Amino acid sequence: HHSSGLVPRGSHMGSIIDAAAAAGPVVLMETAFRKAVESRQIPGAVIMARDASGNLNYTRCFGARTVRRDENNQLPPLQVDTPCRLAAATKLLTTIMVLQCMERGLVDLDETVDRLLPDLSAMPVLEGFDDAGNARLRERRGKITLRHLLTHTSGLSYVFLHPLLREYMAQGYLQSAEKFGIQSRLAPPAVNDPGAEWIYGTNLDWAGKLVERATGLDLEQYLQENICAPLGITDMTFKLQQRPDMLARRADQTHRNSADGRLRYDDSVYFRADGEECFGGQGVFSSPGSYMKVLHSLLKRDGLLLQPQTVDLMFQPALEPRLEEQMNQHMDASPHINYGGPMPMVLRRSFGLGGIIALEDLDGENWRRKGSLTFGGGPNIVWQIDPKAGLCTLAFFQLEPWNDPVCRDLTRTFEHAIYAQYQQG
Numbered sequence: 001h002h003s004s005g006l007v008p009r010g011s012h013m014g015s016i017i018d019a020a021a022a023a024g025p026v027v028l029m030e031t032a033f034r035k036a037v038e039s040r041q042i043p044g045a046v047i048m049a050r051d052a053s054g055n056l057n058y059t060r061c062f063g064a065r066t067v068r069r070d071e072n073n074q075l076p077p078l079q080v081d082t083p084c085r086l087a088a089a090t091k092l093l094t095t096i097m098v099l100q101c102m103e104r105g106l107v108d109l110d111e112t113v114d115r116l117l118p119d120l121s122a123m124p125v126l127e128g129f130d131d132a133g134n135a136r137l138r139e140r141r142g143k144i145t146l147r148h149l150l151t152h153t154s155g156l157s158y159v160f161l162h163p164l165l166r167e168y169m170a171q172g173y174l175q176s177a178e179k180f181g182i183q184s185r186l187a188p189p190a191v192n193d194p195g196a197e198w199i200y201g202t203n204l205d206w207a208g209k210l211v212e213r214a215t216g217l218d219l220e221q222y223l224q225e226n227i228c229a230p231l232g233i234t235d236m237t238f239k240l241q242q243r244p245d246m247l248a249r250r251a252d253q254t255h256r257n258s259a260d261g262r263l264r265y266d267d268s269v270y271f272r273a274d275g276e277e278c279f280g281g282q283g284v285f286s287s288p289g290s291y292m293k294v295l296h297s298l299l300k301r302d303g304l305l306l307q308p309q310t311v312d313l314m315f316q317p318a319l320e321p322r323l324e325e326q327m328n329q330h331m332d333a334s335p336h337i338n339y340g341g342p343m344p345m346v347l348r349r350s351f352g353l354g355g356i357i358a359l360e361d362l363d364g365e366n367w368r369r370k371g372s373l374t375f376g377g378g379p380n381i382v383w384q385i386d387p388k389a390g391l392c393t394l395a396f397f398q399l400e401p402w403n404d405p406v407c408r409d410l411t412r413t414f415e416h417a418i419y420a421q422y423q424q425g
């Protein structure tokens with residue numbers, strides 16, 4: 001029997017083991033993250049999950065925001081409020097800003113870009129190269145609309161992804177299209193006509209210019225007034241170099257070397273210069289906490305950023321059958337790029353406004369459902385919103401290259417565990 005005036009706890013090996021039940025999925029998953037930090041496989045990570053109701057409000061932070069030791073010879077922690085490089089996780093923010101312009105009657109999604117982006121309309125299509133080493137350029141067929149930009153179906157690509165453009169750079173055509181070591185996302189030509197194929201490209205850099213020109217505000221000021229202010233966010237900016245308080249606390253980028261799998265400090269150009277202009281495809285710095293506030297508002301359909309019916313538009317498959325099948329073919333054949341991060345490498349998908357849409361359940365009732373929206377950012381950041389499950393999640397790393405196996409595996413383990421314990425319906 002228990003001791004007088006003391007709580008009856010476990011008094012021997014039998015009842016102490018039985019004092020608490022076995023470890024559930026989330027506890028086991030946290031141990032995997034702690035082991036990855038301890039064994040030096042990752043620098044650190046922040047993982048977050050929320051439902052609409054508020055009953056799920058889960059945030060865990062592991063490890064360091066850098067591999068560089070501080071003034072006290074320590075590795076400072078990656079925190080929920082640590083300023084991080086979002087890279088392509090910026091695209092969701094820019095998509096929201098575009099849709100607000102639509103709501104306010106400043107733009108129409110199906111109007112051609114010619115009016116606000118005559119500099120894009122005038123850009124030719126790079127068809128190939130001549131034998132002497134000269135670009136063969138031609139006129140675009142059909143018009144680019146704002147909806148082509150939001151769905152990556154405009155004909156635009158990225159220089160570091162398409163072979164025609166990689167050659168274009170090698171020939172010296174983009175020597176003068178860069179400042180502070182940051183290359184312009186507006187200078188390079190298109191590689192196809194609009195509507196022809198899904199191609200990942202500088203579409204949101206152009207869409208951000210459209211927002212600036214539609215509103216008469218620079219994207220930074222538009223961001224502050226229309227996304228940050230309504231959510232009470234004070235640390236989300238294109239202009240990190242103008243915020244000494246964020247600079248003093250920011251993450252460093254870490255890179256994993258292909259040869260020995262070791263983590264090294266990545267002296268990224270993006271952390272020493274903001275660049276002259278706001279690039280809505282890649283340019284925002286923020287904390288995981290503030291990014292989750294964006295995801296959560298969208299999940300809740302609380303009208304703080306967009307009207308609920310406009311948010312619903314983001315989750316609708318935007319691609320006609322021909323493009324849907326071409327995008328899926330491309331993505332299935334490109335696991336070395338892997339736009340979908342932790343998702344199964346073969347999956348029926350479409351593209352919405354702001355990310356990839358799952359057209360089927362990822363694993364029946366165990367994980368993300370049909371209708372879920374997702375994308376990511378370079379440093380292994382992955383976000384998703386799942387209206388059917390009533391969940392949104394984010395996994396924030398500051399580690400390149402994209403599609404790192406350790407990060408992807410941990411991210412999958414995180415989501416699986418959260419869905420197993422907390423998914424509803």
Ligand SMILES: CCC(C)(C)C(=O)O[C@H]1C[C@@H](C)C=C2C=C[C@H](C)[C@H](CC[C@@H](O)C[C@@H](O)CC(=O)O)[C@H]21
Binds near residue numbers: 087161337338377
């Ligand atoms: C500039 C990087 C960008 C496009 C904003 C970005 O976040 O896309 C990420 C997001 C992810 C969902 C899909 C991606 C598709 C293709 C790439 C492997 C890309 C990461 C490339 C990056 O590791 C190297 C660049 O940073 C080079 C440069 O900036 O010149 C990666």
